Structures are given as C-alpha cells and as structure tokens.
Write a protein that binds this ligand. Structure first.
Ligand SMILES: CC(=O)O[C@H]1C(=O)[C@@]2(C)[C@H]([C@H](OC(=O)c3ccccc3)[C@]3(O)C[C@H](OC(=O)[C@H](O)[C@@H](NC(=O)c4ccccc4)c4ccccc4)C(C)=C1C3(C)C)[C@]1(OC(C)=O)CO[C@@H]1C[C@@H]2O
Ligand SMILES: Nc1nc2c(ncn2[C@@H]2O[C@H](COP(=O)(O)OP(=O)(O)O)[C@@H](O)[C@H]2O)c(=O)[nH]1
Lengths: 441, 429, 441
C-alpha cells in the first residue's frame, strides 16, 4: 500500500496542513468527524484513502500525519476548530515556548526536547505502513520551528530510514514582503539540510501568490487562508496518481527520476494553470492546449521569478480529469516549437506527462470554480537562482556588521556556522551557473 | 500442439494484452466468465494454442501478467476480463519500477523473477508440444524494458529453441512523455539483439497517424492505439489457429524474414483501415488491400520505407480469397518498385493466406516488413542518448541501483553497431 | 474385520481427534448423535465403518477411540460441544492436574495413576476386535501428556500386544514458533519411545502448515482448528484403503513394508497435493499428472524442510477418487526423469502406488473445496535430519547451563537421563548421514 507521511512543522506548516487535510477529506469523501458516509459501499483503498488515512476499526479514518509545534498555540486552533475529532490525539504534539524566530533555539535548545517524542510518533506510523513511500515535510524557511526544528528532524529521518523520498514544501522568503527582520539569518542556516537531506525541495513565496489571487482570480484581499487552498491543489495533484487510477501514473519516485538531473539540483518550482474566478470561468476555452500554455507563463509562477531569465531543465505535467492524451502531445509539440521557452541543450527530450482521471475538488468556501482539467507543472529551471541572489544579498548586508549575532551564539551555535552555510549556498548558486551552460567542442 | 505462452510485462504490456485477450477471446467465442459460446467448430480445434481448457469447459489462457506495481493488476481483475485469467498468474510486487531500467533489471526484478519462472514452468510443463513465447512490453518503461529483458535472458537458459518474439513499443522524438526514455531504451535494445527471434517494433506517432489520417478518428487514447496493435498480433499467428491455403506459423515467418541473425526487427502493417461511413465507398478487394500495405501511411513504425529498402516482407491474408490475385499483386509490386527492394534477394515477399477473416469484415491482410529504414529509429534514440550521456545526466539513479558506466558505453555501441548492419544491407549491391 | 484403535493424548492429541472424528462421521454418513440416517439400507461394514465404529445395537455407532488427558478441561470441551453423545462415556478419561509441560510428571508422577485405567479401556476395545490392525496414537512432542504419558503408554502397549502396527501422529517443535520454553526438554525425552516402540512416527509442525494455508489456500489467519482439518485428510487417506474398495489397496502393514528400509528409519513425512481454495479450484487442471508433481514440491511439505537438501528413500502414493492408473505410471516416469529429485542409489525402484475409489469429503465449514482426486505422499527422505539439527541445538543450548533441571529432577527422573536421550537422538541423526550415502566399490 502506497502510504505516505505528512509532517507539519511550525506555524506555517500547521496552517497549510489545515488546508491540505481539509481537502483530502473532500477527495475521499470523509466527514470532519473522520467518517465516510453511508453512500460508500465501494472500494476504499480502491479510491485509496489508504495512503493518507489509516482506517481505524468501525469505519474511521485517521491520517498518517503528525502536527508538530514548539508553541502550544497553533495546534490549539485545531483543538477545537472543526477538525477536533478528525485528528488522533497523539499526533498533535506541542512544546511550551516556540523557537521564537531563532534557528539556534529550534535546532539545539528547544528542538531536542521534543525530537525524540516526535521520532517516536513517526515509528508508530512507520510500523503501521506496508509499502511506505516517503515523507512530506511542510514548513517555512524563516521561522524558528520551520527552520531550526526541520533541520533537526531531517537529520534524524535520514539516519533511521535513508531509502524513502522526503519531499519538502517550503515557503521561501519574499524579496519585499517580510515580517521578521532576522528572516535571512534563518534561511541561510536551513540551507544545510535542505540540499543535503531532502530529496526534492519545493519553494513558494507569498508575493508570487498574491499576484495570482489578485490578477487571475480577482480576489481583492487575500489572507494566508486563501493562499494555502492554492498550495494544497498543487500538492493534491502531486500525490494524486499514487492514489487514483489514470493512464501514465506517476509515483513519488517517478518525479525524482524524471525531474532531477543531478544530486543537488532538486529545487523545482510548481505551477498550476486553471486559477479561474467563477465569472471568468465562462469565457473559458479551458482545453488542454490552453492550460498547457498557461503553465509556461512567467506570470502564473508560484515563485517570484521569470523563466525568461533562465533555461528550463525538465518539466513535468500532472493532469487531472477529462483528458485525451493526443491533445497533450500536440500541446507539447507547440511548446517545443516556441523559442521564448529555452530548454537546455542537454535535455533534449523535454518532459514527462502524467495524467489522472480524478478531477479536483472545489474546496467549499474556496476561491476556485468548478474546472474539468488541471495541471501542475513541476519544472526545474535555472531561474530559481535569481530568488537566491536576492536573499544572499540581504544576508550579506546584515552579517557584514554581525547584527543579530549575540542572540544566536548564546543559544547553542557558533559564529563559524554562518560562514559555512553562506559558502554552502554560494556553491548552489554556482551549480546553477554551470548547469545552465551547454558544453561545446 | 504449438502452444504460445504469453508474458505481458509492465504497465503498457498489460494494457495491450488486456485488449489482446479481448480480441482473441472474441476469435474463439470465449465468454467474459470463461465459458465457450461459439457455433463453428473451427474455434475449438485450435483453441489450445492460447487456452488451457479447465474443468467443465472453462477456458483459461496461457498468459502470465508481470508487474512491479499492484495497480494494473487490480484494474484488470476488477474490469470485464478479470474473470478470465488464473489468479495465480497475477504476479506482482509492491514497490514501483521508477521508469528506471536498473530498478526493474537488478534490484527489484531479480527478487521477483524466481516467483515468475516458477509460473512459466507451470505453463510449460502442461503443454503438449510448445512452440513459442511472446512478450508484450515497452522499450522506455521500467518493467517493460528492464524486467522484460531479465525474463527473456532467463528463458533462453531454459527453453533455448522456442520462437521468442516481442511486440515492443519504441520511443519517438515527436511524442515524449518520460525524460530518460533514451537511457531505458538503450539498455534494452542491447538485450533484444542477442536474445530474441523476432521483434515487432511499434511506435506511438505511427499509431496516431493511422488514427488521424486513415481511420479518421478524433481523439485517440492508449485504449485506441493498442486496439489496432492487437489486431496485428492476432494476424501473426492466424494460420497457427485457423486452417488456411498457405500456412505460416511463427517459425515459418522467422525463417524467411531474417537474412542474417541479429536483424530481426520488423515493421508491421495492417489493412484495411477505413472510417465508418467510408466503408461503403471503398470496394474491398486484393488490389485495394495491397496498395495500403505498400503505403507508408499504414506503417505502425514511424518511418518511411522510402528511406531504405525492404530486405524481406511477409503478407498474411485472412479471407476467402484467390491465389492468382494474391500471386499477381505481390508480383506487380516488386516489379514496379524494384528499387525499393533489396535486389540480392529474389522474391522478397512471402504470402500466406488464411481462410478466416476478423469478426466484422472480409479480406483483411497483414504486412510484416524487414526494411532497412528502421535504422531511422535507432539513430534518433542514439542522438538523444549521446546528448544526455555526455553530461552524465540522471546518472545517480542508475549507478545507485547496481549498474555502472561500462554497461552504458557498451550498450550504446551495440545499438550503434546495428545501425551499421542495416546500413550495410541497404546499399553495397 | 480390519479394526483399528485411535488413542488421543494430551491437549493437541484431543483437539486433532475432534477434527478426525468429525471427518469419519462424514465419511461413513453418521450424524453427530452416532446414527446412520434412514437412506442407508446398504452394506455398513461394506462401506466399512467397522474399522472405526463398533456398531452398538439399535443402529448406533461408537468409535474404537480413547480420549485421554491428565487435565479435565480439554475433554470437557467434548462434553458438551456437539460430540457429547457421539462418544461412549467411558472412553473419556480425565485426570485432575495435567503434567504441566513436564515430562517427569507425565511419565512417572501423574501418568502412572491413570495408566492402568487407560490400558484397561484398551482391553475393552481389544477384546471387541476380531482382526485388530494396530493403534493410532495422536499427541505432540513438547506437551507433558503428549510426551510423558505417550512414552509411558507405548511401553505398555509393546508388552501387551507386540505384533500390531503402532502409528504415531506427532507434532514436531517448530524452529521459530514455540510457546513453552522447555519445549526442547520434552522432545529429547520422548525420543526414546518414538524410535524404539512406535513402528512409524509421523512428524508435522505448525509453520509448514501456516505456509500452506496462507499460500495455497489464501486463508488470512489460521487457528489450530484450521490446521487439524488438514491433518485429518492425511490420516483419512492413509487408512482409507483398509475400509474402502479400490485397485491396489494398502493395508496398514503395507506401508511399513514398502516405506521403511531399516529398523529406525521410520520417520516419513506426509504431503497432500490438492490444497485448493474454492475460487482457485476453477482454474484447475487437477489431473493426476499435476497432483503427482505437487507432491514433490518442497513448498507443499508438511515439515519445515526442503527435500532439495536430502535424498528421498521411498515414496508412497495414496490416491483417492476418479483415477486411471496408467496416468499415474506416466507421471511416475516423469518423476524418475527429473534430476532435481534425488532418490538414493540403492532404492532403485522408486515407489508404491495405491489407489482408492472413495473421494474425500469436504468438511462442512472446512477450508478445502470439492476435489476429484487427492494424494498423500508418505515419503522417507534424509531431509528430516535437518528438522533434528535445528532442535538439538536448542536443547544443547539450554542444557549447557542446566537451566530447567530443578523442575525435572524433583518429579521422578534423573540428571543422567538427559545425557542418554541426547546420545540417543544424536545416533539417529548419524543414521541418516550414513543412509543418504551410496556405497561404491
Ligand atoms: C459494421 C461493421 O462492419 O463494423 C466494422 C467497421 O466498421 C470497421 C471500420 C473496423 C472497426 O475498427 C475500428 O474502428 C478500430 C478501433 C481500434 C483499433 C483498430 C480499429 C470495428 O470497431 C472493429 C470490428 O473488427 C472485428 O470485429 C475484427 O474481428 C477485429 N476485432 C477487434 O479488434 C475487436 C473489436 C471489438 C471487440 C472485440 C474485438 C480483429 C482484427 C484483427 C485481429 C483480431 C480481431 C469491425 C469489423 C467493425 C467495428 C466493430 C466498427 C476496422 O478495424 C478492424 C480491425 O476491423 C477499422 O477499419 C476496419 C474496417 C471495418 O469495416
Ligand atoms: N503502447 C503503450 N505503451 C505504454 C502504455 N503505458 C505505458 N506505455 C509505455 O511504457 C513506458 C513506461 O513504462 P510503464 O509501463 O509506465 O512502467 P510501470 O512502472 O511498470 O508501469 C513508456 O515508454 C510508455 O510509452 C500503453 O498503454 N501502451
């Protein structure tokens, strides 16, 4: 059984998961009290709730997810909220003080106190698995728990397990919008485990999502609650071919084999094409051809980036619903035709399609409309180096005067560690300079 | 007598064969449940070529379904034709193949092949006098490519003299839906060279082209393209199952299709292909069918025969037809197009004529061509191969699984040598 | 009249017999209240109930069997259960405390107190016999009553009777699965009477049966109740040619003459080929040829063993139902052909077939389906020495530190007796090393 583990770390990581685990409840037809209703005398793990829901006896569905925070407060929104009996009680693990936007606290001081209780929750879910697929860590670069703790966990998860996929859903720091002033300190230090221990790190940021809500979608005034329904459709499609039938299904490992060229070049941005408001959902031509072109739009990116500034290295089309493939292959051939889209010269064969039959669900009270087709495009590009150049420069400014150093050293790390994680990220940005360039003879 | 063991392997392998045993199961009037509901005793004389009769006139195929993923098996079980297979023949692992060759050939394939060859010996020990085998698989998949070539290279050690042929789907550069399908196709072309008796190379673009132009379809799925392919695979072994005026087994083709060893890569062709509506406007005959078979636009391999020469062809007709018209049409072709044939072989064509058409029309035919123009396939792959491999891209998912570089360089050279085998036999008198 | 005596000793020995005497009730058409129904104006001892059922006056069938336990509790499941008036009251002999997994208690302390009452039950059944065939002791090596008492009885049965066959149906200790930790103590001490006094000891073990239920049969979760229906089809076929017509009938003594080379080489394992679930019973080709090959399968063994590790010495085919012999002789000749199957070089003529006409019965609520043919293969092989090497090593571990010695010595045996029964079993295992080897000149 294609089972998978969600881990939701820190405030952002929890609050995304609300929007994730809201959705799968609708995907598999599960009430907020964990119950499938009486109109499901059909095959459950044939609809494959069984990758995200361990079926407790007597018709009861509890996730394979763990909600971890160093602060009591965030998860206590999940107790009560409405999800107060969806979750297993023992998978909502609270500390007492958060890391408090301090990586040294989340990794050394506070994080170690709950790390074995969290790893022991993993084992209770790891031993219930048959054919474990891997882990889905949610967090934000630029928290304390999202960076400090996640770094601590990913070390421990690499040692105990090794073999399985470990996906990350980070939120990257936005170039203008930021709310912590040590936001770049906590991102340089999370660099270390993100490239080393994760197998595939995704990056999103809030400004590139603000664009999409306002422009494609005509929402006046987004909150985090609005953005995360969007986040969840990207992840819901990723992991949909594990757990629904379709031609050209794609396991969690078939991404990495088809998306990721080299060891540490594993930072693909996602997109999602049918972001359409109810009114604008008429005046559609929402065919396969138009929705494939919309993925390659530099405005429909989930990262503050412009792929016109770099070259794609792989793409990866994950479609849901009313789909005929030859429409897709004819829309690929258009994509290969255009010269505004630069692939690299060593790719040649562009990219991997994957289709699934299960159409998305419209999240109730949600922002999307009812679409028939839907497409994430996970896609390596050299344009995500530009996100890094804009953030190293913020780190290099503050660390030039050794600003907030006294908070960090007095918590269980060294001055020396800044100089290593800065070199570490400077080498990544040098890898993408050397991976964009073809070789000639 | 003359039984055929069917080993459908991988995802693609299972989809085709799903539709394959929906045709054969119509050829012999097999119920979905497995009972017989025919009327003509031709359907039973040679049922045993594919089907074990079981207790109480149920008919269980001799097919073995192999996978590294539970999904396709659960689909087939739950579908119209789940009932038809024996449940001990649904052999499958749990951990997916990765669309990785190494993962299906060394790590997770070798673990399973013991539990599968033990099913091959259930089938092979029950037959009267076995003729041959067959994979249905995909060069460009994990289990189709890797696990398929592990099964093959372990059958030649057991059954070293049975006609083992494959219906292998080969990649086309116009339609890509996997990034490392050059890696996965290169390392399996290497195995098909030394191990196989006939290889029916099929592409994707060549099957849309039939759907769009000839059949006048709108919106093709895998469901539709393999429905074609299964009408070819039925044709191959028709004279093995039905009586004919000329007969032709698997072995009969093999023998006079294949000049030299190693050059066993065939291009199928089917005729007729009409749209519905445009059937009352073609008169259905033998000159009508011959003109389609020598047409480029009815090749299920995405090449043009005009870029080379047919070494040899075979023409398998199915229907109540004449022998003069057959013997003439097949003559008028290799006169008018004498520069499209290799001239050091007289009578490039072999005809076979069965008596039994498909269950909707009269006078079908099936073209199987050994053309030199198939090096157009092997070069389009060995250009993509050599463009990724010069960077050593996607390498750690392969060296991680027990392989190394030297398996690549040799397998690239084994593909690039047989390009220089079709090349020699095209030109040079 | 071909009459035979069942003796059911200890908890395992009783609880098998439930599954035996369930079956013969169905074989000969006897209700659980001992009555043949009104549709039997046909020949009773011509259907030969008369080997296992003394016909009490007024149409009533009571076994020739004795249920012996040192514990009241087990047999009290037979009073009531459903068999509460099948059995003669005086053939259900209870003690008050069991031997309690202690050989010294079952053989010296507790066993002697009921041994003369049990031997006197034998005489009441021995004197009702005309043409007594022999005894069928059921037990388990690694009980107290199954080992201690059985050892005491078999001594007494050899003295009073001598001449007749005395079959045993042991359960051998499984290499991993065991629930008593002195399980090897009770097996070394039962070695003494098993080789000396029995004429033919069978061995089964629970793991090799777990395999068959799960794999050939697709039962998820076996209990002892499930395994013993299987056990009973092996014994039901053994003793079927005594009591039904067929060509090539085989008495109880024709085993031993055809199965057993030398005095103490009389430990043949059984198999049974058509172990097929209802659904898998279509998609059959269940001919004679396939079912003969299935006997020689190392997976279809009733012992945790692999005949690929030793050589067969004799085999013995006992078939039931819709059988034509020449199909069998053509399936023998296949068996002689294969070189995977090693007979010894002094056998030459492989083995003995026996056929019977009476097809098995499907036990109601039972695990088998309706099969037309069925085959036990009793077969001497040198591979059963491997079962012994795996158990001597467990004895030799615990007896190296003289672990549970204080329980045994304080019950009516000596420390010296361990050293004799260990030498005794080491000589058996040396006999099979010397019986596998051909002689050359
Ligand atoms: C009113 C009438 O006569 O209907 C025909 C029909 O319209 C035509 C168009 C059929 C039709 O075929 C297709 O449209 C098609 C679909 C997928 C893949 C390939 C073809 C037909 O569907 C297919 C069907 O074929 C058969 O019955 C053959 O025995 C064939 N069987 C299958 O492929 C099959 C189809 C459905 C269910 C089970 C089996 C066959 C061919 C080779 C080897 C074995 C079997 C036939 C004659 C027809 C229809 C029904 C419309 C044609 O095809 C074949 C293979 O016969 C397409 O061009 C021919 C000419 C026929 O006249
Ligand atoms: N003709 C054909 N090819 C297929 C089909 N499905 C997958 N393929 C091919 O198989 C390869 C992928 O292998 P797949 O079957 O997905 O491997 P799996 O992990 O074993 O399912 C590609 O080269 C595809 O073109 C099908 O239905 N028909």
């Amino acid at each position: 059984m294609r089972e998978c583990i969600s881990i939701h770390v820190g405030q952002a990581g929890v609050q995304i998961g609300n929007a994730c685990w809201e959705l799968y409840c609708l995907e598999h037809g599960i009430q907020p009290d964990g119950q499938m209703p009486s109109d499901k005398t059909i095959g459950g793990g044939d609809d494959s709730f069984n990758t995200f829901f361990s079926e407790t006896g007597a018709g009861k569905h509890v996730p394979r997810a763990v909600f971890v925070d160093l602060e009591p407060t965030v998860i206590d929104e999940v107790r009560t909220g409405t999800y107060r009996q969806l979750f297993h009680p023992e998978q909502l693990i609270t500390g007492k003080e958060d890391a408090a936007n301090n990586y040294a606290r989340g990794h050394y001081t506070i994080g170690k106190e709950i790390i074995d209780l969290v790893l022991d929750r993993i084992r209770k879910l790891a031993d219930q698995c048959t054919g474990l697929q891997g882990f889905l860590v949610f967090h934000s670069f630029g928290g304390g728990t999202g960076s400090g703790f996640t770094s601590l966990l990913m070390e421990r998860l690499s040692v105990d397990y090794g073999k399985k996929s470990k996906l990350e859903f980070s939120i990257y720091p936005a170039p203008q919008v930021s709310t912590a002033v040590v936001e770049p300190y906590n991102s340089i230090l999370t660099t270390h485990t993100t490239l080393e221990h994760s197998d595939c790190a995704f990056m999103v940021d809030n400004e590139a999502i603000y664009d999409i809500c306002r422009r494609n979608l005509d929402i006046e005034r987004p909150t985090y609650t609005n953005l995360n329904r969007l986040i969840s459709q990207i992840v819901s499609s990723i992991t949909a071919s594990l757990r629904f039938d379709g031609a050209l299904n794609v396991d969690l490992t078939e991404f990495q084999t088809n998306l990721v060229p080299y060891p540490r070049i594993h930072f693909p941005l996602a997109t999602y094409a049918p972001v359409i408001s109810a009114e604008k959902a008429y005046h559609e031509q929402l065919s396969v051809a138009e929705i494939t072109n919309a993925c390659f739009e530099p405005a429909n990116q989930m990262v503050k980036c412009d792929p016109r500034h770099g070259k794609y290295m792989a793409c990866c089309l994950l479609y849901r619903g009313d789909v005929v493939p030859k429409d897709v292959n004819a829309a690929i051939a258009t994509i290969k035709t255009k010269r505004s889209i630069q692939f690299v010269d060593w790719c040649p064969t562009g990219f991997k399609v994957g289709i699934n039959y299960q159409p998305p669900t419209v999240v109730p009270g949600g922002d999307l409309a009812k679409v028939q087709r839907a497409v994430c495009m996970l896609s390596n590009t050299t344009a995500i180096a530009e996100a890094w150049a804009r953030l190293d420069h913020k780190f290099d400014l503050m660390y030039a005067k050794r600003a907030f150093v006294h908070w960090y050293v007095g918590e269980g790390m060294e001055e020396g560690e800044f100089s290593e994680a800065r070199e570490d990220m400077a080498a990544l940005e040098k890898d993408y300079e050397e991976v964009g360039v073809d070789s000639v003879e | 007598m003359r039984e055929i063991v069917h080993i459908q392997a991988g995802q693609c392998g299972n989809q085709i064969g799903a539709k394959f045993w929906e045709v054969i199961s119509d050829e012999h009037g097999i119920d979905p449940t497995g009972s017989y509901h025919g009327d003509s005793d031709l359907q039973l004389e040679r049922i045993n070529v594919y089907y074990n009769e079981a207790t109480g006139n149920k008919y269980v195929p001799r097919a073995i379904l192999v996978d590294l993923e539970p999904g396709t098996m659960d689909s087939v079980r739950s579908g119209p034709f789940g009932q038809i297979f024996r449940p001990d023949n649904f052999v499958f692992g749990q951990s997916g193949a990765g669309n990785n060759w190494a993962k299906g050939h060394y790590t997770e394939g070798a673990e399973l092949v013991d539990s599968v060859l033990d099913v091959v010996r259930k089938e092979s020990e029950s037959c009267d006098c076995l003729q041959g085998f067959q994979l249905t698989h995909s060069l460009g998949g994990g289990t189709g490519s890797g696990m398929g070539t592990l099964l093959i290279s372990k059958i030649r050690e057991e059954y070293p003299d049975r006609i083992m042929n494959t219906f292998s789907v080969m990649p086309s550069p116009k339609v890509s839906d996997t990034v490392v399908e050059p890696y996965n196709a290169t390392l399996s072309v290497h195995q098909l060279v030394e191990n196989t008796d006939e290889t029916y190379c099929i592409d994707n673009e060549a099957l849309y082209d039939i759907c769009f132009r000839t059949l006048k379809l709108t919106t093709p799925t895998y469901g539709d393209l393999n429905h074609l392919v299964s009408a070819t695979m039925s044709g191959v072994t028709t004279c093995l199952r039905f009586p004919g005026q000329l007969n032709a087994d698997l072995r009969k083709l093999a023998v006079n299709m294949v000049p030299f060893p190693r050059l066993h890569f065939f291009m199928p062709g089917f005729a007729p292909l009409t749209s519905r509506g445009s059937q009352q406007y073609r008169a259905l005959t033998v000159p009508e069918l011959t003109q389609q078979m020598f047409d480029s636009k009815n090749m299920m391999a995405a090449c043009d025969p005009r870029h080379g020469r047919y070494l040899t062809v075979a023409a398998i007709f199915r229907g109540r037809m004449s022998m003069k018209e057959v013997d003439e049409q097949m003559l008028n072709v290799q006169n008018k197009n004498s520069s499209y044939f290799v001239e050091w072989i007289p009578n490039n064509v072999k005809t076979a004529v069965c008596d039994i058409p498909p269950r909707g029309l009269k006078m079908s035919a099936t073209f199987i061509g050994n053309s030199t123009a198939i090096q157009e396939l092997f070069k389009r792959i060995s250009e993509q191969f050599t463009a990724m491999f010069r960077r050593k891209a996607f390498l750690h998912w392969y060296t991680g699984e027990g392989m190394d570089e030297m398996e690549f360089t040799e397998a690239e050279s084994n593909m690039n040598d047989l390009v220089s085998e079709y090349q020699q036999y095209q030109d040079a008198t």
